[PDB]
Structures are given as structure tokens and as C-alpha cells.
């Protein structure tokens, strides 16, 4: 499905699989996409969360506290959960609502919040990372970057 994904956004979903592997989970949940997103660290999604005053280390610690560590590291491909698949479906819907013709890390963060049930949504809203607030923060951050770039 990942044809519309930017290099950074594909980097997030590859990192989600490796986050599951290292915690000994044989699934990729909303929790592993959120960890892949903060692991990437550089994209509009990580910057959007930091610009709301949220600690990325603090996000990792909150997620890891909830999900714990499985018993046996799995082998090869790790299957997405249906709600993780829903995050990725909603990332596309959020890109269309912003009039973007790409799926960036910022659309994955919106997808994670909009899924509204998982470990990712629970941690994020608890930190004040609500959907309409983050949509506006992503638009404003993109606008702010394009104005700064315009200086060089």
C-alpha cells in the first residue's frame, strides 16, 4: 500500500516492525507505529509532538510501561493488527483532508490519533495530542518550515 508513502514515512513503518521484534511481540500494534514514529525522530510528526511540549523519551516510556515485553522474539515478517492497519488507512484519509498528495510521518501521527482506541491514541490524547489540535499544529509547522526555508 506504501506507494504514496514518503521515504521518512516508510522508514516509520519499517521501524514499527523492528520495535515489535526487540520487545518480543509477534504483532505490529498501534503502539509499535507510535514507537517507530518517535524512533524516526526527525520528521514533521516528531517535531509536531515536541512543538506541543511532549517529551519523545516520555512517550516511549509511557508506551513500554503499558505493553511490557513478550517472552520470545519472532522470526521474519511480523503481522500488522487490524487496528494498526486502520491507522495506515486513516493516514491516507488525513492526507486527503489536508489536500496533500503524499503520506508523510505527519499523516501517520494523525492516523494514530484518529484510530481512537489503541495504546497509541490513549497515550497521545492523555498528553493533550487531540486530533483537531494536531491537524492544526501539522499545517502550522509545515507553513513555518516553508517560510524558514524561503530565507536560504
Residue numbers in the entry: 1 to 152
Please share excerpts from the published article on this structure:
ClpC1 is a 95 kDa caseinolytic AAA+ protein with an N-terminal domain (NTD) and two nucleotide-binding domains (D1 and D2). The NTD (amino acids 1–145) has been studied extensively to determine the most critical residues for the binding of ClpC1 to several natural cyclopeptides with potent anti-TB activity.
Excluding the four N-terminal residues, the r.m.s.d.s between these two apo structures and that with bound ECU (chain W) are 0.43 and 0.68 Å, respectively, explaining the importance of these structures in solving the large asymmetric unit of the ClpC1-NTD–ECU complex. In addition, helices 4–5 and 8–9 were shifted by about 3–4 Å owing to a pivot point in the 70s loop. It was observed that one conformation is captured in the apo form and the RUF-I and CYMA complexes, with a second conformation being captured when ECU was bound, in solution or in the ECU-resistant double mutant ClpC1-NTD-L92S/L96P. Apart from the protein termini, the 70s loop is the most flexible portion of the NTD structures. The region consistently has higher B factors and was more challenging to refine, with unusual orientations of residues.
